[PDB]
Point group: C3
Chain length 425, copies 3
């Protein structure tokens, strides 16, 4: 493959603890993008020459570092009321003073788990013969609005407080052994006689991503990745507008284990009934729409029960290596790529998080990186030797695509035309 990646080569004197000093060769690879691979040939002065040491970055991924978790139900709004004339039942003298948001009337008809999350009260109703009462003073309306979880469906929700880079590299030793591993950052690792490699860290050009949260439906394990509320903040209109501290608490939305804002349910008292209004957000609908694998604005998120993100523009992440070699000379194998191509389609949505699909047929003499810069967006992707079609996603702002793009594949540049039609949503 033989990418040009070694950008410094040095000979330093290194000493242990009199003193024991010797010459160390060192080769610095400041920036290696996913898919790229270097080929390093070591020969001792006596020689011949080894097959090369190959150093490839397979991927540099984003791992979710979680905030505290909580559980959410698929909640449904319910309301009930019963009216008692003054001097009847509890209404001996108007609304009884104790009857408050945790109170339950025995006169109630509907589903009343007395342990469920909700809000009760009692209100004045009309009295007199006109409203079916002997006593003309106001009647009592004992009412409750609450939420239940009839489907027993529950999601564990874990906000991603940040994402952390995690590299996977692939090394081919001159013996031919292939090693695929997450390296230990900053620790020189002896690979074979006289040669050690240090992974010096990963870097990313993507700043301040939007807050996303892992969702896992319990007892089905199916995952989603979507916005959610901070733990303990029951803000209406989001996953997490109801939050529970256990699976069972969420299954039955228990008052003692769940929080909410009671305005999620509206109740309208009428003389002889009540009208219920749901302002609830369907958790199920959000998870349906947000299933993994998903492309969200330049990053593909996928599941291993942990979620990781892969930047789609592979030139926006890189890893750095240092190679030391003792008593050996280094030669680099470096070759340019012959690569040409044409766009065969653009299709999809505009002003959408997925971005449109750009279909690009390329022929390439070796594995390399394709770059596509348009006026709306720009991206890069790995290209395989031979002739193949690639479908990177790119973001456009309008239904009509008709613009100049520049394709750069292995240093060869051409001005392609992108034309197509895209939908909203």
């Amino acid at each position: 493959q033989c990418d040009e990646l070694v950008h410094a080569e040095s000979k330093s004197i290194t000493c242990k603890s009199e003193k024991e000093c010797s010459v160390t060769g060192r080769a610095l690879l400041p920036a290696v993008n996913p898919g790229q691979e270097a080929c390093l040939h070591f020969s001792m002065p006596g020689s011949p020459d080894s097959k090369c040491l190959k150093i490839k970055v397979k991927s540099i991924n984003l791992r979710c570092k979680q905030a505290s978790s909580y559980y959410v139900p698929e909640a449904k709004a319910r309301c009930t009321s019963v009216r008692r004339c003054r001097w009847a039942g509890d209404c001996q003298s108007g609304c009884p003073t104790y009857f408050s948001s945790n109170s339950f009337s025995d006169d109630w008809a509907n589903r009343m788990d007395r342990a469920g999350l909700g809000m009760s009260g009692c209100s004045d109703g009309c009295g007199g013969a006109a409203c079916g009462c002997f006593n003309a003073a106001p009647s009592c309306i004992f009412w409750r609005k609450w939420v239940e979880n009839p489907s027993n469906r529950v999601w564990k929700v874990s906000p991603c407080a940040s994402w952390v880079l995690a590299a996977i590299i692939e090394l081919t030793l001159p013996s031919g052994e292939v090693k695929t591993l997450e390296p230990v950052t900053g620790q020189a690792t002896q690979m074979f006689k006289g040669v050690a490699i240090t992974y010096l860290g990963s870097s990313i050009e993507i700043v301040g991503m939007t807050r996303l949260c892992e969702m896992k439906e319990m007892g089905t394990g199916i995952m989603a990745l979507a916005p959610c509320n901070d733990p303990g903040h029951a803000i209406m209109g989001n996953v997490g507008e109801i939050q529970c501290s256990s699976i069972e608490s969420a299954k039955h939305i228990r008052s003692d284990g769940c929080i909410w804002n009671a305005d999620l349910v509206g109740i309208e008292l009428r003389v002889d009934d009540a009208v219920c209004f749901s302002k609830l957000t369907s958790v199920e609908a959000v998870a349906n729409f947000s299933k993994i694998p998903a492309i969200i604005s330049g990053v593909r998120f996928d599941q291993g029960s942990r979620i990781y993100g892969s930047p789609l523009d592979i030139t926006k992440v890189s890893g750095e290596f240092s190679v030391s070699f003792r008593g050996m000379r280094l030669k680099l194998s470096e070759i340019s790529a012959s690569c040409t191509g044409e766009i065969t389609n653009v299709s999809g949505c505009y002003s959408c998080m997925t971005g449109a699909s750009v279909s690009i047929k390329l022929h390439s003499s070796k594995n390399t990186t394709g770059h596509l810069k348009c006026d709306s967006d720009e991206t890069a992707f790995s290209v395989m030797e031979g002739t193949h079609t690639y479908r990177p996603h790119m973001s456009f702002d309008k239904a009509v695509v008709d613009e100049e793009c520049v394709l750069n594949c292995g240093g060869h540049s051409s001005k392609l035309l992108l034309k197509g039609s895209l939908v909203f949503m």
Copy 2:
């Protein structure tokens, strides 16, 4: 200009595919801040010496990577009601069972686009002669609260799911040709005989920026950058508390194309009228306050119809280059700057996103970077040769500014005094 920027210079043997091996000179520039420029002199063994290759970073900017878009109206709250005695009109037997949140009474007086977003209902009202009715049973109050867009003003809102770095570099070839371009990351670009340059990527020291969204007023194109709701989440108190899927849907806030939380409008039924309460957030007021260009906490945001951010502290972003040279010797031109200065003013706000303005008159023998570290904040900016006044922004926490600051300009350090007075908001 001649900044010290080449921090490694090497001579490696590079080979193609027997084998064809030759010596490649390589120069690594690990970190170049905006405004900085290197000067590289190449001479062949026979010589004289070329004018230099100049490599300057013009800017490293943040480009908005959008989430899905939506449209928002400048919404205004409306309410209406009509009361019908029992046995009159629809109220033949109390509130009719069908009359619900999408129902419209023909008895209504006010603006009723039956396609608009809103919520209807009917409620019991007082009956009898005391409330103007023959029948003593409860009357019916048919009511609706809704939102309209009388100004027809609409903004397209595009949340920025993340920001991505984008570099602009300026190269001066020994021939004197100046090239200003966004380079292709990771691809060696042949510049002139024997010399190629690779841009190895950009890096930024600013972590996890606050969520901002592009706003564009339709039919005026004027832009703003401000917080907003995630698409599909109609959280009250934010741009995006009402969201529409098209311009026309937003112009007339259509029920079929818009979402909201109906608690954005309050209605109070009285016997013979209703009181309307608006809890709406003015979109216009947010966009007014959030016009581009804007400084938001260390980053200047500006328009090209796309928005980009420029870190104001120019030492917090950098680009990395590698230069290869074949059959040539390299010499670096590097000069230090003579530079002194004094603070002439500090004015503005404290505890504000803009930060205060610090006025600094500097004299400098060459283009260089000024650094100002204070106890409250710290920044750096590009400085031009000659005598000029600069106005970097810095953040303070109190109305009274009276503190030690250190000014570093081209390696020369001095302890300046910052004194001034600032306002809240």
Copy 3:
């Protein structure tokens, strides 16, 4: 200490302004993690050899770059009402038209700061003898719901719009002088005869952190770090659901200096009283739970009255240096560490922002970096020579810990067993 950190060493020709050209030695340290230290020995051709120049990264921290600030009260909900028969008091002809959300009834009993934030109104009540009135037409209910701050407790809230890296380095000159400083990024600093050092910047592998806000209780100075609302957006369920523009405005929640959503307080009118509902979020409770120092998902936040964050995985931040040396030879002192250890405990919470505590006893021949990779999480920490116990935090997803972990300490790897039990919350 003698870490392997110099990964390039070069000899370039550098020229001033005929021309004055000379040879400059340069040593590049691409990536130095906190706790690591290099030892550089300079000898002039005549020699002996200096004690070394030591270059250590003490810390690379995250500094909060603030949005605009605001003040929040510890708010408490209040309600009052008074009912006047028709033809009595203001109720001469029903609810008076002027009586609206800023109106105050002189008939009111409760705490009425007429300058406080709140919402008034008047509503129809029942008339006639049945409701204590001679006139049978509807009575008037004059009511108000508002918020007060009885404790006078106020927090200044400053959202962190982003976090910026700030490095502290420690240099030991051959003379033995120790210098601890924040370096000036990108400026070559002359250290001693012939030697200068450039700090080339900091880098971090943590992307897009969750929005946090500094909180400072006024008149106590005690700090917290917690989510909050954007300035000017009074979204219910968060710190900042009530926002004030001054300390005094927050102390008494003045209408002219504070904003809110009036649905934070509910009022239910009954015939002869009103029921008050608080939907307020206790600011005090959030600050209590969010006190500094706090570990939030991989970062320890601590106070200097400014807050800074320290990444706990020290291999996820690094600094870069360049050293120039004039007329001298360089030798590197580099030694590997002997280091072994065992896990002695894991205790704490799962699916929590703190993460569990893993207790690790290590013996090490020198200061070095310990790395612990488990299936749930992975971290690294600084290790001191000798035998010591370390307690890095790691995130697990389940109450039962029983998994393979790999410990890497100075290049020595061992597969440890992690077993323990953790709680939710």
